[PDB]
């Protein structure tokens, strides 16, 4: 019988710098997630990235200096014919229809949106993210 | 650019749980170079033992899944999920991940004649309300692993026992996944 192996590799993106007004740029590639091991046929709706903030469709990053500076990110990817697709993030998809994941592995891009409260401060921001895959 | 690796392997991709059996065993491997806590949950008529335990780098252990209570239907299969989680000017971003690897726990009466692949061909199809609808007259989940319509790939889903499921629209072709987790033969029908 066939094991259910799941792997993830996270590659960090370029350094982020706050600009002169206090915003980070939007659409910045925070980093790249490669999901692997799943059996061909596994679909985008069967992958759910969750975090403690639990904001539907976004992963929330929080400062570690006790001022609760936050920004959000989306998680998105491309299918074989270049449609934007996305896994569930806190239970909901931001873009695309449900699709079969690419054979072998699928890359997803973690991309900055913005801060709803705004002015960010320099320092370290973190998130702890669970990736649930529901195997067929 | 620094990378971080994560991985959890379950020794099978589905559990067929004979209704009223004492229990079954499932192996978990931590395929990584650091220790993890393995956190196992079912989505309490089943218990997973141990629900949380330390699994050292590169090690494998076994979970016991045991029916401890729960009444369930005697003419049809039932479905639960076993989920196994491995818990490991500048704006510095630090993210940690954890994989939660989920598989089907199919509760199956012993009495039911045959297995799923004997009934794979019995799926019937209609188009309605902008949707492609499969009907499953068997007592088993038909866990479709590959599905096409008009020759275009459709993201698959199981069809529940004695029931239906509805697919968005993109001749029907499908393969179910069998009890050993392999892809089964291709069937094809006009709607």
Cα–Cα dist B70/B53, whole Å: 25
Cα–Cα dist A37/A104, whole Å: 6
Work out how many domains chain A is built from and give that number: 1
User: Is A4's CB within 8 Å of B9's CB?
Assistant: yes
Tokens of A119: 């002015």
| CB-based contact, A41 to chain B, within 8 Å | yes
Tell me which residue range forms the domain holding A88.
Answer: 1-136
Domain limits, CATH 2.60.40.10, in chain B: 8-110, 114-188
Cα–Cα dist A134/A44, whole Å: 10
A42: which chain B residues are within 8 Å (Cβ-Cβ)?
none
Evaluate whether B139 touches B161 at the Cβ level (below 8 Å).
Answer: yes
Residue owning tokens 């072998």: A104
Four-residue CA torsion sign, A124, A87, B2, A130: positive
Evaluate whether B168 touches B137 at the Cβ level (below 8 Å).
Answer: no
Four-residue CA torsion sign, A41, B163, B148, A47: negative
Asked how this structure was determined, the answer is X-ray
Evaluate whether B35 touches B57 at the Cβ level (below 8 Å).
Answer: yes
Please give, rounded to a whole number of angstroms, the shortest distance from the CA of B95 to a CA of chain A.
5
Tell me which chain B residue has its CA closest to the CA of residue A80: B153
- Domain B114-188 of CATH type 2.60.40.10: yes
Residue B62: count of CB within 10 angstroms of its CB:
11
Evaluate whether B60 touches B29 at the Cβ level (below 8 Å).
Answer: yes
Classify A68 in phi/psi space as left (phi over 0), alpha (psi -120 to 50) or beta: left
CA neighbor of A43 nearest in space, from A125, A119, A133, A127: A133
CA neighbor of A15 nearest in space, from A4, A25, A5: A25
Evaluate whether A22 touches A123 at the Cβ level (below 8 Å).
Answer: no
- Three-class DSSP category at B97: strand
Cα–Cα dist B66/B23, whole Å: 4
| CB-based contact, A61 to chain B, within 8 Å | yes
* CATH number of the CATH domain containing A26: 2.60.40.1090
Write down the CATH number for the domain with range B8-110: 2.60.40.10
| Cis peptide upstream of residue B53 (ω within 30 degrees of 0) | no
Pairing of strands A70-78, A29-36: unpaired
Q: Which of B93, B100, B183 sits opposite A125 (nearest CB)?
A: B93
Cα A44 to chain centroid, rounded = 13
Q: What is the DSSP letter of B151?
A: T
Q: Which of B9, B96, B183 sits opposite A5 (nearest CB)?
A: B9
| CB-based contact, A52 to chain B, within 8 Å | no
β partners of residue B2: none
Nominal resolution (angstroms) = 1.7
User: Is B3's CB within 8 Å of A37's CB?
Assistant: no
User: Is B94's CB within 8 Å of A125's CB?
Assistant: yes
Evaluate whether B99 touches A8 at the Cβ level (below 8 Å).
Answer: yes
- Three-class DSSP category at A123: strand
| CB-based contact, A96 to chain B, within 8 Å | no
Residue owning tokens 């008529």: B45
Cα–Cα dist A65/B17, whole Å: 49
Buried b (16+ CB within 10 A) or exposed e, B147-156: bbbeeebbbb
Q: Which of A16, A127, A131 sits opposite B100 (nearest CB)?
A: A131
Residue B33 CB-density burial (10 A; 0-12 exposed, 13-18 middle, 19+ buried): exposed
**3-state SS string for A69-115:** CEEEEEEEEECCCCCEECCEECCECCCCCCCECCCCEEEEEEEEEEC
């Amino acid at each position: 019988v066939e094991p259910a192996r799941i792997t993830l590799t996270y590659k960090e993106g370029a350094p982020i710098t706050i600009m002169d007004n206090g915003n980070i740029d939007t659409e910045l590639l925070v980093g790249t997630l490669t999901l692997g091991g799943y059996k061909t046929g596994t679909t985008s709706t069967s992958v759910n990235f969750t975090d403690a903030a639990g904001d539907p469709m976004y992963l929330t990053f929080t400062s570690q200096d006790g001022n609760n500076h936050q920004f959000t990110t989306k998680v998105i990817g491309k299918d074989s014919r270049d449609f934007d697709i996305s896994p569930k993030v806190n239970g909901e998809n931001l873009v695309g229809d449900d699709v079969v994941l690419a054979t072998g592995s699928q890359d997803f891009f973690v991309r900055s949106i913005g801060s709803k409260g705004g002015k960010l401060a320099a320092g370290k921001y973190t998130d702890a993210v669970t990736v649930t895959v529901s195997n067929q | 650019f620094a990378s971080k690796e994560y991985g959890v392997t379950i020794g099978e991709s589905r559990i067929i749980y004979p209704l009223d059996a004492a229990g079954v065993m499932v192996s978990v491997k931590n395929t990584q170079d650091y220790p993890v806590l393995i956190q196992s949950r079912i989505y309490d008529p089943f218990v997973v033992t141990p629900p949380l335990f330390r699994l050292d780098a590169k090690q494998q252990n076994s979970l016991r899944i045991a029916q401890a209570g729960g009444v369930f239907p005697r003419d049809k299969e039932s479905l639960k999920w076993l989920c196994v989680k491995g818990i490991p000017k500048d704006v510095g971003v630090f993210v940690q991940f954890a994989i939660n690897n989920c598989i089907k726990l199919l509760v199956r009466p012993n009495e039911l004649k045959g297995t799923p692949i004997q009934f794979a061909e019995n799926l019937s199809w209609k188009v309605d309300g902008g949707k492609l609808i499969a009907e499953n007259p068997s007592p088993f989940y038909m866990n479709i692993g590959e599905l096409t319509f008009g020759g275009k790939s459709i993201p698959s889903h199981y069809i529940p026992p004695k029931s239906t499921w509805a697919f968005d629209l993109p001749n029907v072709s499908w393969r179910i996944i069998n009890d050993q987790g392999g892809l089964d033969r291709l069937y094809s029908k006009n709607v």
